[PDB]
Design an enzyme around this catalytic site. Sequence first.
Site, PDB file in Angstrom:
ATOM      1  N   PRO A   8       0.826  -1.224   0.000  1.00 59.49           N
ATOM      2  CA  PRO A   8       0.000   0.000   0.000  1.00 59.49           C
ATOM      3  C   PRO A   8       0.865   1.281   0.000  1.00 59.49           C
ATOM      4  O   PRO A   8       1.889   1.342   0.689  1.00 59.49           O
ATOM      5  CB  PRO A   8      -0.798  -0.128   1.302  1.00 59.49           C
ATOM      6  CG  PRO A   8       0.081  -0.967   2.189  1.00 59.49           C
ATOM      7  CD  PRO A   8       0.681  -1.967   1.271  1.00 59.49           C
ATOM      8  N   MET A   9       0.457   2.300  -0.784  1.00 62.92           N
ATOM      9  CA  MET A   9       1.170   3.571  -0.873  1.00 62.92           C
ATOM     10  C   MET A   9       0.206   4.697  -1.134  1.00 62.92           C
ATOM     11  O   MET A   9      -0.441   4.704  -2.182  1.00 62.92           O
ATOM     12  CB  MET A   9       2.231   3.562  -1.994  1.00 62.92           C
ATOM     13  CG  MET A   9       3.513   2.808  -1.672  1.00 62.92           C
ATOM     14  SD  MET A   9       4.525   2.553  -3.148  1.00 62.92           S
ATOM     15  CE  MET A   9       3.581   1.278  -3.977  1.00 62.92           C
ATOM     16  N   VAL A  10       0.133   5.668  -0.199  1.00 61.34           N
ATOM     17  CA  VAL A  10      -0.654   6.899  -0.283  1.00 61.34           C
ATOM     18  C   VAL A  10      -0.268   7.585  -1.601  1.00 61.34           C
ATOM     19  O   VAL A  10       0.920   7.654  -1.941  1.00 61.34           O
ATOM     20  CB  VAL A  10      -0.426   7.807   0.970  1.00 61.34           C
ATOM     21  CG1 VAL A  10      -0.991   9.203   0.774  1.00 61.34           C
ATOM     22  CG2 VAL A  10      -1.031   7.184   2.218  1.00 61.34           C
ATOM     23  N   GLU A  33      -3.565   3.904   1.695  1.00 63.84           N
ATOM     24  CA  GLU A  33      -4.317   3.968   2.946  1.00 63.84           C
ATOM     25  C   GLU A  33      -5.446   4.992   2.795  1.00 63.84           C
ATOM     26  O   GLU A  33      -5.219   6.128   2.344  1.00 63.84           O
ATOM     27  CB  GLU A  33      -3.395   4.345   4.116  1.00 63.84           C
ATOM     28  CG  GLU A  33      -4.050   4.360   5.484  1.00 63.84           C
ATOM     29  CD  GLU A  33      -3.324   5.215   6.506  1.00 63.84           C
ATOM     30  OE1 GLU A  33      -2.330   5.879   6.134  1.00 63.84           O
ATOM     31  OE2 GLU A  33      -3.740   5.210   7.687  1.00 63.84           O
ATOM     32  N   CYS A 106       2.001   3.480  10.072  1.00 66.19           N
ATOM     33  CA  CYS A 106       2.009   4.919   9.696  1.00 66.19           C
ATOM     34  C   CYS A 106       2.840   5.865  10.632  1.00 66.19           C
ATOM     35  O   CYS A 106       3.182   5.438  11.728  1.00 66.19           O
ATOM     36  CB  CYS A 106       0.574   5.426   9.545  1.00 66.19           C
ATOM     37  N   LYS A 139      -0.686  -4.668   8.650  1.00 70.19           N
ATOM     38  CA  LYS A 139       0.680  -4.362   8.267  1.00 70.19           C
ATOM     39  C   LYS A 139       1.305  -3.619   9.412  1.00 70.19           C
ATOM     40  O   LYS A 139       0.831  -2.552   9.777  1.00 70.19           O
ATOM     41  CB  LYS A 139       0.699  -3.541   6.962  1.00 70.19           C
ATOM     42  CG  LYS A 139       2.086  -3.245   6.416  1.00 70.19           C
ATOM     43  CD  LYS A 139       1.982  -2.568   5.064  1.00 70.19           C
ATOM     44  CE  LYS A 139       3.295  -1.956   4.656  1.00 70.19           C
ATOM     45  NZ  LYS A 139       3.486  -0.576   5.166  1.00 70.19           N
ATOM     46  N   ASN A 198       8.626  -7.298   4.041  1.00 73.95           N
ATOM     47  CA  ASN A 198       8.575  -5.957   3.469  1.00 73.95           C
ATOM     48  C   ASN A 198       9.684  -5.102   4.054  1.00 73.95           C
ATOM     49  O   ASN A 198      10.021  -5.258   5.223  1.00 73.95           O
ATOM     50  CB  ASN A 198       7.160  -5.326   3.739  1.00 73.95           C
ATOM     51  CG  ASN A 198       7.008  -3.881   3.348  1.00 73.95           C
ATOM     52  OD1 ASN A 198       6.936  -2.996   4.203  1.00 73.95           O
ATOM     53  ND2 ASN A 198       6.968  -3.600   2.043  1.00 73.95           N
ATOM     54  N   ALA A 226       7.029  -1.885  -2.280  1.00 74.95           N
ATOM     55  CA  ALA A 226       6.562  -0.510  -2.325  1.00 74.95           C
ATOM     56  C   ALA A 226       7.414   0.375  -3.274  1.00 74.95           C
ATOM     57  O   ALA A 226       7.150   0.364  -4.481  1.00 74.95           O
ATOM     58  CB  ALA A 226       6.487   0.072  -0.928  1.00 74.95           C
TER      59      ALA A 226
HETATM   60  C1  LIG Z   1       5.079   7.069  -1.228  1.00 71.77           C
HETATM   61  C2  LIG Z   1       4.870   6.051  -0.138  1.00 71.77           C
HETATM   62  C3  LIG Z   1       3.629   5.969   0.484  1.00 71.77           C
HETATM   63  C4  LIG Z   1       3.376   5.040   1.493  1.00 71.77           C
HETATM   64  N1  LIG Z   1       2.073   4.898   1.954  1.00 71.77           N
HETATM   65  C5  LIG Z   1       1.815   3.896   2.762  1.00 71.77           C
HETATM   66  C6  LIG Z   1       0.407   3.532   2.991  1.00 71.77           C
HETATM   67  O1  LIG Z   1      -0.569   4.017   2.416  1.00 71.77           O
HETATM   68  N2  LIG Z   1       0.246   2.429   3.815  1.00 71.77           N
HETATM   69  C7  LIG Z   1       1.268   1.679   4.378  1.00 71.77           C
HETATM   70  O2  LIG Z   1       0.983   0.711   5.093  1.00 71.77           O
HETATM   71  N3  LIG Z   1       2.562   1.992   4.114  1.00 71.77           N
HETATM   72  C8  LIG Z   1       2.828   3.019   3.323  1.00 71.77           C
HETATM   73  N4  LIG Z   1       4.108   3.183   2.865  1.00 71.77           N
HETATM   74  C9  LIG Z   1       5.172   2.249   3.276  1.00 71.77           C
HETATM   75  C10 LIG Z   1       5.361   1.084   2.308  1.00 71.77           C
HETATM   76  O3  LIG Z   1       4.155   0.332   2.167  1.00 71.77           O
HETATM   77  C11 LIG Z   1       6.492   0.165   2.773  1.00 71.77           C
HETATM   78  O4  LIG Z   1       6.127  -0.384   4.033  1.00 71.77           O
HETATM   79  C12 LIG Z   1       7.901   0.755   2.872  1.00 71.77           C
HETATM   80  O5  LIG Z   1       8.177   1.707   1.838  1.00 71.77           O
HETATM   81  C13 LIG Z   1       8.971  -0.313   2.929  1.00 71.77           C
HETATM   82  O6  LIG Z   1       8.868  -1.175   1.779  1.00 71.77           O
HETATM   83  P1  LIG Z   1       9.876  -0.949   0.520  1.00 71.77           P
HETATM   84  O7  LIG Z   1      11.344  -1.116   1.024  1.00 71.77           O
HETATM   85  O8  LIG Z   1       9.618  -2.104  -0.466  1.00 71.77           O
HETATM   86  O9  LIG Z   1       9.686   0.412  -0.017  1.00 71.77           O
HETATM   87  C14 LIG Z   1       4.416   4.187   1.914  1.00 71.77           C
HETATM   88  C15 LIG Z   1       5.669   4.275   1.305  1.00 71.77           C
HETATM   89  C16 LIG Z   1       5.911   5.185   0.279  1.00 71.77           C
HETATM   90  C17 LIG Z   1       7.287   5.247  -0.335  1.00 71.77           C
END
Ligand SMILES: Cc1cc2nc3c(=O)[nH]c(=O)nc-3n(C[C@H](O)[C@H](O)[C@H](O)COP(=O)(O)O)c2cc1C
Length: 312
Positions: A8-10, A33, A106, A139, A198, A226
């Site tokens: 998930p990513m905002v 989210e 978060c 998560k 993750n 992500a």
């Molecule tokens: C732009 C952006 C927005 C994010 N928004 C959320 C979100 O909506 N919900 C969430 O659980 N984590 C959010 N995350 C965290 C990612 O889901 C993830 O846990 C984190 O970046 C580590 O994984 P990665 O190393 O593969 O990036 C966000 C990360 C990024 C970079």
Amino acid sequence: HHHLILAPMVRVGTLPMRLLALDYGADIVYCEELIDLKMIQCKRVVNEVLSTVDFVAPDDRVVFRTCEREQNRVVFQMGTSDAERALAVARLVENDVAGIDVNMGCPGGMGAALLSDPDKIEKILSTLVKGTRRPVTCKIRILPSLEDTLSLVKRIERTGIAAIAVHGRKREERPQHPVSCEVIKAIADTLSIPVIANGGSHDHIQQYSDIEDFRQATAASSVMVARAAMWNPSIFLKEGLRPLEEVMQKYIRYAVQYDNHYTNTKYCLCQMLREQLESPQGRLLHAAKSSREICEAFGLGAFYEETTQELD
Ligand SMILES: Cc1cc2nc3c(=O)[nH]c(=O)nc-3n(C[C@H](O)[C@H](O)[C@H](O)COP(=O)(O)O)c2cc1C
């Protein structure tokens, strides 16, 4: 065969990125989210023009948009600190999504703030598990104490949740700081339910073949990506990475087909381009005041006119 998941990513995790992630080989796609306080104000609207199911707020803003293509693969992530409000949201979206996720990682006291109140996490999760026919997941980020992380994780499984996504970093630990493969492993061994690894995008995942390596290093059932998916969604493609010009063309085509708000399209493109934002195309993208102007910057102006005309 293991599962490749879009984390998930905002702003990033809107319908266009989810459809593009599935095209490149993701098995499950999580949405951005969405706060329970906004979602409880929404009406479910069947959109015959776009062939989507829309969740519209009183101001006429479409908060969540889904379609038949992702019907069996989309996971709805919610921001919640109340069990009744969480169930109200799940009952709204359950017929259109494949799963229900609760953010517990978060930075109004919802994400990693929940990790301190296991009594509240237990209340929220059990209410959802008992109240919906859809698999419930959550998560989390790890705790400063390995004893407390393991204690909380066994407490979370006891609620009857289908799986748990573990971001191998503590709250306050910046992305600069490496991921804890050891803490994800200790969790995956102690649990009977599947654990989604993750946290290893720049440091561990730069190509497709590295995803399997990270699943081994963490002893998880699946990996959630992500940042690496945000930078280039073709990270899910087994055959290798695709040129960014190609990926961005496919991104914009989806954004127009599905009437995505231009500021959202622009955002996701800036995240892909990053250092290429100083190229004449990046300058044009930064300057774009509409979807037509985004398509103009990428030689998709003909496509926009034909889609806009066929949609209207
Ligand atoms: C732009 C952006 C927005 C994010 N928004 C959320 C979100 O909506 N919900 C969430 O659980 N984590 C959010 N995350 C965290 C990612 O889901 C993830 O846990 C984190 O970046 C580590 O994984 P990665 O190393 O593969 O990036 C966000 C990360 C990024 C970079």
